[PDB]
């Protein structure tokens, strides 16, 4: 029934509404269609809704994605370069962006089932290459996990721990490159 997905979309949103910013540790696991690991990592995540974030992967390699709300900075220490792009030109329909934005109009684009604290989302139609994603969200609005199955059956999951809800310093959402780092400013 449609009434179960409306109910679930409304409960997903009310839960996520309780947390306007957070910090967490994360683990990331990505695998191809074969169930073989193609990337794994861990680090820190800061979010302030609707569109400020800092994803800082620290192992096995360092990389940073930081959004100041308009600019997305991608810092790759391996090449000593950071790129600047516009946030609006990124993939706006990743699971992560949905969770950051927490917009009712976004959630209305999915059929949603709630099994406990797991919300399972399937696109009401697809030419965007997500088949399914899942968000585990507690009653208090803490996110514990999210995972996505891409169209090529590539699978990614993120597990979040040590969540602290509450105010994050603005500095987390600005980027400053270390000494010696060059900037590729791609913003048109």
């Amino acid at each position: 029934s449609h009434m179960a997905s409306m109910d679930a979309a409304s409960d997903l949103k009310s839960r996520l509404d309780k947390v306007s910013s957070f910090h967490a540790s994360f683990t990331q696991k990505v695998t191809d269609g074969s169930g073989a690991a193609v990337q794994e990592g861990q680090g820190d995540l800061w979010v302030k809704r609707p569109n400020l974030f800092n994803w800082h992967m620290t192992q096995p390699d360092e990389s940073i994605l930081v959004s100041d709300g308009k600019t997305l900075w991608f810092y790759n220490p391996f090449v000593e370069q950071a790129t600047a792009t516009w946030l609006k030109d990124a993939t706006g329909n990743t699971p992560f962006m949905l969770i950051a934005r927490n917009q009712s109009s976004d959630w209305q684009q999915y059929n949603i089932k709630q099994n406990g604290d797991d919300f399972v989302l399937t696109p009401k139609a697809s030419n965007g290459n997500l088949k399914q994603f899942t968000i585990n969200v507690g009653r208090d609005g803490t996110i514990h996990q999210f995972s996505a199955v891409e169209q090529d059956d590539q699978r990614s999951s993120y597990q979040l721990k040590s969540q602290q809800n509450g105010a994050v310093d603005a500095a987390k959402f600005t980027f400053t490159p270390p000494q010696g780092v060059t900037v590729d400013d791609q913003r048109k």
Binding site: Q28, V38, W55, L65, F78, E80, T91, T182, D184
Partner: protein, 230 residues
């Protein structure tokens, strides 16, 4: 050897990687398979290479290329053809690039400009999507060999190249081979290889040209045979 084979050998195969001994999976560790372990038949010279197909973007245009990441201390077949630029300026960590002169004019760049180099085959998965490996490189000049390679090859430092390819630190694509007879890579590929290594050669770039030379050669021997019996 006809003019066609001569042209291929002297003006194409002489200025690109004729063959490369790479890892069976992923990149190659030079500690696990060092240059000394590369003793192969039909090979007169071995050198480290990192290479891949790249997309290039300048302020004006887009182009496709082949990145030749080289040890700049050793002579490459392109080295003599550098135009007012020293190969040793391709210092590791500077992300300098020497472009084929036609590639440079396609992009509308020269010494002192930048280009963005992207490797579509090398990606990072992030929560904002898959991000291809890319970096700005500083154009420090060009080479002009009077060959089609002027329109697509470029030289960079091998180590810059390896980071762009997202290889584990210190790995390379493999061991570039120079052959006594580059036209017989068919036979030379069959030989005994070190273990968990594999053979790639110029047929990957120019499989339509190795087939056209082979067709022609067998048409020639068949008719010479027909002429000689009857």
């Amino acid at each position: 050897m006809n003019g066609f084979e001569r042209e291929l050998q002297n003006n194409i195969l002489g200025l690109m990687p004729q063959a490369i001994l790479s890892s069976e999976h992923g990149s190659l560790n030079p500690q696990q398979l060092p240059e000394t372990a590369v003793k192969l038949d039909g090979v007169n010279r071995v050198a480290p290479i990192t290479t891949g197909d790249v997309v290039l973007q300048s302020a004006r245009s887009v182009a496709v290329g082949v990145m030749l990441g080289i040890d700049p201390a050793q002579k490459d077949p392109l080295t003599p053809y550098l135009v007012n630029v020293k190969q040793t300026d391709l210092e590791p960590g500077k992300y300098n690039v020497i472009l084929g002169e036609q590639l440079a004019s396609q992009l509308g760049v020269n010494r002192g400009d930048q280009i963005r180099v992207m490797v579509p085959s090398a990606s990072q998965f992030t929560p904002m999507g898959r991000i291809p490996s890319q970096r700005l490189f500083n154009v420090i000049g060009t080479f002009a060999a009077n060959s089609e390679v002027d329109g697509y090859e470029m030289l960079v430092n091998i180590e810059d190249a390896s980071r762009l390819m997202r290889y584990p630190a210190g790995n390379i694509t493999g061991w570039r081979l120079w052959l006594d007879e580059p036209l017989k890579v068919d036979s030379l590929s069959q030989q005994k290889l070190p273990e968990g290594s594999k053979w790639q050669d110029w047929r990957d770039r120019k499989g339509e040209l190795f087939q056209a030379v082979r067709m022609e050669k067998n048409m020639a021997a068949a008719l010479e045979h027909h002429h000689h019996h009857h």
